[PDB]
Design a protein around this ligand. Structure first.
Ligand SMILES: [Mg+2]
Ligand SMILES: [Mg+2]
Ligand SMILES: [Mg+2]
Ligand SMILES: [Mg+2]
Ligand SMILES: [Mg+2]
Ligand SMILES: [Mg+2]
Ligand SMILES: [Mg+2]
Ligand SMILES: [Mg+2]
Ligand SMILES: [Mg+2]
Ligand SMILES: [Mg+2]
Ligand SMILES: [Mg+2]
Ligand SMILES: [Mg+2]
Ligand SMILES: [Mg+2]
Ligand SMILES: [Mg+2]
Ligand SMILES: [Mg+2]
Ligand SMILES: [Mg+2]
Ligand SMILES: [Mg+2]
Ligand SMILES: [Mg+2]
Ligand SMILES: [Mg+2]
Ligand SMILES: [Mg+2]
Ligand SMILES: [Mg+2]
Ligand SMILES: [Mg+2]
Ligand SMILES: [Mg+2]
Ligand SMILES: [Mg+2]
Ligand SMILES: [Mg+2]
Ligand SMILES: [Mg+2]
Ligand SMILES: [Mg+2]
Ligand SMILES: [Mg+2]
Ligand SMILES: [Mg+2]
Ligand SMILES: [Mg+2]
Ligand SMILES: [Mg+2]
Ligand SMILES: [Mg+2]
Ligand SMILES: [Mg+2]
Ligand SMILES: [Mg+2]
Ligand SMILES: [Mg+2]
Ligand SMILES: [Mg+2]
Ligand SMILES: [Mg+2]
Ligand SMILES: [Mg+2]
Ligand SMILES: [Mg+2]
Ligand SMILES: [Mg+2]
Ligand SMILES: [Mg+2]
Ligand SMILES: [Mg+2]
Ligand SMILES: [Mg+2]
Ligand SMILES: [Mg+2]
Ligand SMILES: [Mg+2]
Ligand SMILES: [Mg+2]
Ligand SMILES: [Mg+2]
Ligand SMILES: [Mg+2]
Ligand SMILES: [Mg+2]
Ligand SMILES: [Mg+2]
Ligand SMILES: [Mg+2]
Ligand SMILES: [Mg+2]
Ligand SMILES: [Mg+2]
Ligand SMILES: [Mg+2]
Ligand SMILES: [Mg+2]
Ligand SMILES: [Mg+2]
Ligand SMILES: [Mg+2]
Ligand SMILES: [Mg+2]
Ligand SMILES: [Mg+2]
Ligand SMILES: [Mg+2]
Ligand SMILES: [Mg+2]
Ligand SMILES: [Mg+2]
Ligand SMILES: [Mg+2]
Ligand SMILES: [Mg+2]
Ligand SMILES: [Mg+2]
Ligand SMILES: [Mg+2]
Ligand SMILES: [Mg+2]
Ligand SMILES: [Mg+2]
Lengths: 207, 122, 143, 62
RNA sequence: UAGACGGUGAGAGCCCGGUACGCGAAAACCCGGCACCUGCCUAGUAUCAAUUCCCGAGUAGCAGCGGGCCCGUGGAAUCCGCUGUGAAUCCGCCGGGACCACCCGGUAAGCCUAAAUACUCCUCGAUGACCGAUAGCGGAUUAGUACCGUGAGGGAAUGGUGAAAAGUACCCCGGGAGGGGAGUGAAAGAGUACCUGAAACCGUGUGCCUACAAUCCGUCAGAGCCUCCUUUUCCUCUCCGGAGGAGGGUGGUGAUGGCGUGCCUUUUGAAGAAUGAGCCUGCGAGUCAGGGACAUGUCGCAAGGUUAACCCGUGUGGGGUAGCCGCAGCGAAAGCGAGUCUGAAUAGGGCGACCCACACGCGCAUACGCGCGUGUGAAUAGUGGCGUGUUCUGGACCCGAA
RNA sequence: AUGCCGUGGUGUAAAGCGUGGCAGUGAGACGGCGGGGGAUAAGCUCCGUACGUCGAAAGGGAAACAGCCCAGAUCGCCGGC
RNA sequence: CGCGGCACAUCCACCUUGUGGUGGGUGUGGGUAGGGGAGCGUCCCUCAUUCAGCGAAGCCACCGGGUGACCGGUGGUGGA
């Protein structure tokens, strides 16, 4: 509930209080599962396609006469039983995406963040690199000071181009703005590191 | 996701062709013919696992009849007399005794004859 | 935590039935059975085999429909009493704010329930019983 | 594609406040001279649709 | 600020092309600016008068016959065509769903007009819970080619040595083809018929059975052979190893005995002399769309539930109240409304509302309770998403005519 | 005589009824008993039958032999009646 | 009928005393059209984890295993 803010190359400076109505919600497993499934479904392209017997090239006329040959009745050379013919119930371009209610989405995100906070995986920092120029070496040293786990979600403001670039290509580190937080990314991360102003903005956007 | 069928499809084919070894002609070489032969074979084995229980009783009764008539008594009256005497040995072991220990079988026949009623038509 | 820990609620998702996949399931006719129409096509709901159907041998319902009819959203004095225990003024905006009535519609007050609170209801087209109940309670009913 | 309702069915049936489906009755349009008042009064009014027809009339209305 | 992607003798941020990032244009073309240049503006403003003129003509209107509108000629307005007839210029004319009166709105028969919308032969840059050589375009291969047709047209099949060609010098048999030995290679169990290399099908060798027997070709019983392991009494040569003998067990074969009328489809009934199938391999049939409809399982919120288009965001995130469903019914409707309709009816019916397992006061019965206010604490409910079954409109489970 | 309607007792798990979801079927065959048509012929034809079997029922008997007699296969046993 | 294994339904007693398990009785378990319930195998994606040039996939043989679709172990061939 009470998180202490850490500084790069140094120690604590302040503290932040997490409101319990945003970080102490119970964990609805089924709700989060549905929300995450909807997210991943909307992430698809669905650009698969096939050709039906009406779209395969040629094959318009009846290949030979109906009777008197001793062969099966055929009707077209692009019928699905033919090699090179059409596809029956083949894939067509689709749009996988679901209309999950906003209340369910927000509740799932709140539950995930509450689980993280309850296990103690929420960290708060002032900023990543004390300079104005990016430096992956020092940013990685600072993150390793905070954390010894693989997947880390770094939430920083959209105006911190000096600090986003620093941790941009660190493996296992994911960056997103406070207004783009989502259940999938929170649940994939092991620790969530907030910048102080990013955390305050997220808290203010929910009161 | 397009799926090629071969890897899954051959699993049943191998088992059919492996169980169909020893059949002559297409019935051991071709999967479609071996499948029909396997249907017939497993039905036959089911039928025979229940028929042999009567088959062996038939054989035992034949041998018991031979041994009893050798000892001058019908299988008919030997069975009646053994039940009257209260001997509860079954036909498998009666036939086994008749093959192995004829003296013991003669003793059993004496017991059955003794327990049999004096006039068997009353 | 840990995406490999999310599972759906029991009974929420059940596998679809695949209908042309061998004898141990819906085998070859796929539940159709027949040799007739229903083995290849659907029969329209309106078809009855050739006798006059139910939707054609019955007379049309009598009357017309008024193109010019006015509709009122209704609220009862019992609901008013439940929603405004302290009494006071009761307007159409107050009613829509409390959710007792749809918005942007003409409101008519009906007289079902018990009214005890002194209220000042402004609406359209009061009922006969509603006026009596409101004035017995001690308020007023303006239009 | 949006589902279309049946025009004639919607003209000949309607629902009540509890979801019952009601209809009028036949034989009451003409040739009324030889029909006694008992028969005409019986044919008057509205009746609930029969239980063996309710499924199809519901499908027609929806 | 580079861990994108690919290559290199096997999974490479540090080996290579690159990537983040940052520079770079003689000239041509495009866009923008500034000039040149080109054009327009050389008093009419306001007030009064209310006499006169003007305000788009073969037009409007009307009639006949048609077209198109929710509108299938109908009481048929509005809009468009051909034929006939044929005005008026504001005290005019047209519209407001036959038509008339009043009121309201507008000013036909002249022209031009960006943006928000549709599309991709084509050019660049990305991406894919898309395909991977019978798939994906007809076309990874000479592909609209070969070939077929007079012609319009129709229209294929054919990818993989190896890291590197190091692609087998030399010898031998052979006319050659082909092979054997050498040699290269990690591998020739990779030899230009070349990665892996299944099945049908065809050989060669070998164990058992088979030339006196009537067989849906198997199954149960079953002797005898052969093979390989093991407990015994023996070659005790035994550290041996096992020759053999006796037993047991694997595996192969099956003399002989019983039982036994293929599979599918379709039928009252098929081994059927009814249908389909030569065999193997590959391919080949209930799918998808939609805030569709009905019903159910499950999750969120709950007298409320939910957004659509759209806007902002690298995304799956945040906004967006228009709308929809629930919220009171009855009636042809005016209407009325816990009732309403019919009806002369305070008659009866139709449809619709309305808890008692209980106490308190109350008219109340021996009791049972009849109605009213609360609890003794009396039971409601909808809506959005996601599954599943059925259904609708679409080719709609697949194939097939004349 | 049977059958049918009602009612009071007794018995009986997988009866019955209402309301929804999803069906298939709507070509029947033979045998027993009662009838029509037929010549009181048909492995004929059309009805009845809280009649049976087959259909959709394997096993035993009937030489073989859907519909007749016995009997309804959860699997195993070299047990018995 | 005897002895053993399995399953469905139900009754009787416990463990969450019907989310479901535990113990014992009893009844039931032929099946076409068709209805309902629970599973096997193939491929692709995500998350976690674990094998692989000291040899993956595929294929072949043998030895085993499960109530079924089917599974495992060892060896050979092979080369991601
Ligand atoms: Mg075509
Ligand atoms: Mg055609
Ligand atoms: Mg082709
Ligand atoms: Mg194709
Ligand atoms: Mg949204
Ligand atoms: Mg053999
Ligand atoms: Mg027996
Ligand atoms: Mg079949
Ligand atoms: Mg069905
Ligand atoms: Mg049918
Ligand atoms: Mg039929
Ligand atoms: Mg068919
Ligand atoms: Mg239709
Ligand atoms: Mg007719
Ligand atoms: Mg009339
Ligand atoms: Mg009359
Ligand atoms: Mg790479
Ligand atoms: Mg290299
Ligand atoms: Mg018209
Ligand atoms: Mg008209
Ligand atoms: Mg004219
Ligand atoms: Mg008008
Ligand atoms: Mg004009
Ligand atoms: Mg124009
Ligand atoms: Mg435009
Ligand atoms: Mg091709
Ligand atoms: Mg290939
Ligand atoms: Mg030519
Ligand atoms: Mg070498
Ligand atoms: Mg190799
Ligand atoms: Mg090789
Ligand atoms: Mg070859
Ligand atoms: Mg090869
Ligand atoms: Mg011989
Ligand atoms: Mg014979
Ligand atoms: Mg034999
Ligand atoms: Mg025989
Ligand atoms: Mg026939
Ligand atoms: Mg045949
Ligand atoms: Mg034949
Ligand atoms: Mg025939
Ligand atoms: Mg024929
Ligand atoms: Mg035929
Ligand atoms: Mg044939
Ligand atoms: Mg789907
Ligand atoms: Mg729902
Ligand atoms: Mg109404
Ligand atoms: Mg009434
Ligand atoms: Mg709900
Ligand atoms: Mg039913
Ligand atoms: Mg019929
Ligand atoms: Mg019939
Ligand atoms: Mg008779
Ligand atoms: Mg007769
Ligand atoms: Mg007959
Ligand atoms: Mg007949
Ligand atoms: Mg009969
Ligand atoms: Mg049938
Ligand atoms: Mg039988
Ligand atoms: Mg039966
Ligand atoms: Mg029989
Ligand atoms: Mg049984
Ligand atoms: Mg069964
Ligand atoms: Mg079935
Ligand atoms: Mg190696
Ligand atoms: Mg694979
Ligand atoms: Mg292996
Ligand atoms: Mg291998």
């Amino acid at each position: 509930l009470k998180i202490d803010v850490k500084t790069p190359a140094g120690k604590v400076d302040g503290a932040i209080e997490l409101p319990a109505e945003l970080f102490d919600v119970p964990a609805n497993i089924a709700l989060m599962h549905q929300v995450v499934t909807a997210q991943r479904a909307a992430a698809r392209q669905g650009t698969h396609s096939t050709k039906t017997r009406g779209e395969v090239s040629g094959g318009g006329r009846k290949p030979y006469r109906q009777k008197g040959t001793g062969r099966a009745r055929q009707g077209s050379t692009r019928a699905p039983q033919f090699t090179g013919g059409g596809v029956v119930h083949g894939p067509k371009p689709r749009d996988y995406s679901q209309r999950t209610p906003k209340k369910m989405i927000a509740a799932a995100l709140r539950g995930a963040l509450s689980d993280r906070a309850r296990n103690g995986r929420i960290h708060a920092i002032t900023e990543l690199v004390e300079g104005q120029n990016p430096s992956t070496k020092s940013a990685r040293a600072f993150l390793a000071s905070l954390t010894e786990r693989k997947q880390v979600l770094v939430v920083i403001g959209r105006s911190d181009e000096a600090g986003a670039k620093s941790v941009r290509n660190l493996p296992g580190v994911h960056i997103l703005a406070p207004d783009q937080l989502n259940t999938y990314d929170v649940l994939r991360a092991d620790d969530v590191v907030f910048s102080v102003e990013a955390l305050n903005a997220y808290i203010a956007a929910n009161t | 996701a397009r799926v090629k069928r071969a890897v899954n499809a051959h699993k049943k084919r191998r088992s059919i062709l492996k169980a169909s070894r020893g059949y002559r002609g297409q019935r051991s070489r071709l999967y479609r013919k071996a499948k029909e032969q396997q249907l017939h074979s497993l039905n036959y084995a089911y039928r025979d696992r229940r028929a042999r229980k009567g088959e062996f009783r038939k054989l035992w009764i034949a041998r018991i009849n031979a041994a009893a008539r050798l000892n001058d008594i019908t299988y008919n009256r030997l069975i009646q007399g053994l039940k009257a005497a209260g001997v509860e040995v079954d036909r498998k072991n009666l036939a086994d005794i008749a093959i192995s220990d004829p003296a013991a079988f003669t003793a059993l026949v004496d017991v059955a004859r003794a327990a049999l009623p004096e006039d068997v038509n009353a | 935590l840990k995406l490999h820990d999310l599972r759906p609620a029991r009974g929420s998702k059940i596998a679809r039935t695949r209908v042309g996949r061998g004898d141990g399931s819906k085998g070859k006719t796929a539940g159709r059975g027949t040799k007739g129409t229903r083995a290849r096509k659907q029969v329209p709901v309106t078809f009855e085999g050739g006798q006059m159907p139910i939707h054609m041998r019955l007379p049309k319902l009598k009357g017309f429909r008024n193109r010019f009819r006015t509709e009122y959203e209704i609220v009862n004095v019992g609901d008013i009493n439940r929603l405004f225990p302290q009494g006071g003024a009761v307007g159409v905006d107050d009613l829509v704010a409390k959710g007792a009535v749809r918005k942007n519609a003409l409101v008519k007050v009906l007289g079902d329930g018990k009214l005890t609170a002194k209220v000042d209801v402004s609406a359209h087209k009061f009922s006969g019983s509603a006026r009596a109940k409101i004035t017995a309670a001690g308020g007023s009913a303006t239009e | 594609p949006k589902a279309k309702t049946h025009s004639g069915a919607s003209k000949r049936f309607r629902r009540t406040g509890t979801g019952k489906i009601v209809r009028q009755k036949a034989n009451r349009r003409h040739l009324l001279e030889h029909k006694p008042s008992t028969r005409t009064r019986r044919l008057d009014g509205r009746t609930v649709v029969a239980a063996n027809d309710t499924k199809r009339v519901t499908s027609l209305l929806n």
